[PDB]
């Protein structure tokens, strides 16, 4: 199939700062991936983003009942839906699961990577650090970044490039919004 | 900010595909099945505390289809440039042998939202217990998707996620083995 395609997207966005103390509502329209007209609650009217959306801003802004219902969306839509799902979205917190295991960069060679696998946590913001004999190791640390599993959990593999010697204690420290104290896991050769 | 709730919709010609879904901080809350006209919560626990009228969603898709035909005329029938995806294969949990796990195929940064993807075991296709999310919106206004495959890690088996897209000149295969 070689027929050309034509995509149209619409995104109704609610932005929240400090609970519902500050709310921003955006009503965005896209042709393919190019936004051409939007409504910004901080402006109170439709504004065309590209030349393509000028007919829409003119026509929509002439309707009084449309602008008024778009200006109340922060309360009739944004603040309403927040309280509906505030229990299982805003307050969802899943404890992370930390595993430390060794790996190899090239096969058939001794271990040279210490992998700290943090799994299944929510929310996404996380701080994972390595320590060697009590001193933090900030040199030669690679990671996968923060991975969204798509099922309302996250994971990240923070790897340490090092050849472990006997008598060395390596510690992976994990900080998370749902934790009261930093979670640490030791690993010794 | 602190949190973002996005109600994302799209309509695609000439495939006549549409979609209605709610997004929270990059995660799917629910999506409306356009066929059976039902609300599909991403996790079953969500439907207990909240309800959604699936009938209201189909109205926006009707307006979306009409708008698209207006914009297609305005753009003098300028088609969409296909953007090929990135593909990555990961496990949900660290691997142990004879310990159940889940493969995740992550298809990201592509448009239009049409894709053929298939799980392979040792070269043969698998459709057993396979699940997938619907097309999820991004903030550069491309798309991203997830495919899941529960499996038991063994030394004898080998897994690939093959993705097909109009922006790729060959079916992109992403490999996983223990």
């Amino acid at each position: 199939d070689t027929r050309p395609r034509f995509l149209e997207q619409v995104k109704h966005e609610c932005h929240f700062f400090n609970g519902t103390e500050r709310v921003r509502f955006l009503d965005r329209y896209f042709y393919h991936q190019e936004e051409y007209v939007r409504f910004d609650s901080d402006v109170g009217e439709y504004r065309a983003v590209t030349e393509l959306g000028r007919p829409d801003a003119e026509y929509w802004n002439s309707q009084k009942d449309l602008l008024e219902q778009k200006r109340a969306a922060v309360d009739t839509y944004c603040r309403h839906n927040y309280g509906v799902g505030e229990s299982f979205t805003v307050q969802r917190r899943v404890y992370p699961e930390v595993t430390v295991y060794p790996a190899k960069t090239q096969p058939l060679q001794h271990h040279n990577l210490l992998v700290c696998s943090v799994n299944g946590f929510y929310p996404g913001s996380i701080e994972v650090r390595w320590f060697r004999n009590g001193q933090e190791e900030k040199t030669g640390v690679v990671s996968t970044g923060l991975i969204q599993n798509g099922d309302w959990t996250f994971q990240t593999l923070v790897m340490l490039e090092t050849v472990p010697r006997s008598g060395e204690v390596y510690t992976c420290q994990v900080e998370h919004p749902s934790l009261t104290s930093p979670l640490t896991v030791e690993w010794r050769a | 900010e602190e949190h973002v709730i996005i109600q994302a919709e799209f309509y695609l010609n000439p495939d006549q595909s549409g979609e209605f879904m709610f997004d929270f901080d990059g995660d799917e809350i629910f999506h409306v099945d356009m066929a059976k006209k039902e609300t599909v919560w991403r996790l079953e626990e969500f439907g207990r505390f909240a309800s959604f009228e699936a009938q209201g969603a189909l109205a926006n898709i009707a307006v979306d289809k009409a708008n698209l035909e207006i914009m297609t005329k305005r753009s003098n029938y300028t088609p969409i440039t296909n953007v090929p995806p990135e593909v990555t294969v990961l496990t949900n949990s660290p691997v142990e042998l004879r310990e159940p796990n889940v493969l995740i195929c992550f298809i990201d940064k592509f448009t239009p939202p049409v894709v053929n993807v298939t799980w392979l075991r040792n070269g043969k296709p698998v459709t057993t217990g396979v699940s997938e999310t619907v097309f999820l919106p991004r903030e550069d206004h491309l798309f991203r998707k997830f495919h899941y495959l529960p499996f038991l890690p063994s030394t004898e088996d080998v897994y690939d996620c093959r993705v097909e897209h109009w922006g790729l000149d060959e079916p992109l295969l992403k490999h996983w083995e223990f």
């Binding site: 619409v10 109704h12 009503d27 007919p55 829409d56 026509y59 929509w60 449309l66 219902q69 969306a73 009739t76 839509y77 309403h80 839906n81 509906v84 799902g85 | 109600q7 919709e9 709610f22 809350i29 629910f30 505390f49 909240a50 309800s51 959604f52 009228e53 209201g56 969603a57 109205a59 926006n60 307006v63 979306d64 009409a66 708008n67 207006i70 914009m71």
Partner: peptide, 13 residues
């Protein structure tokens, strides 16, 4: 207990 949708507008033909 019910989520509310926000309305898509119709462009001028």
């Amino acid at each position: 207990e019910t989520v509310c949708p926000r309305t898509t507008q119709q462009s001028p033909e």
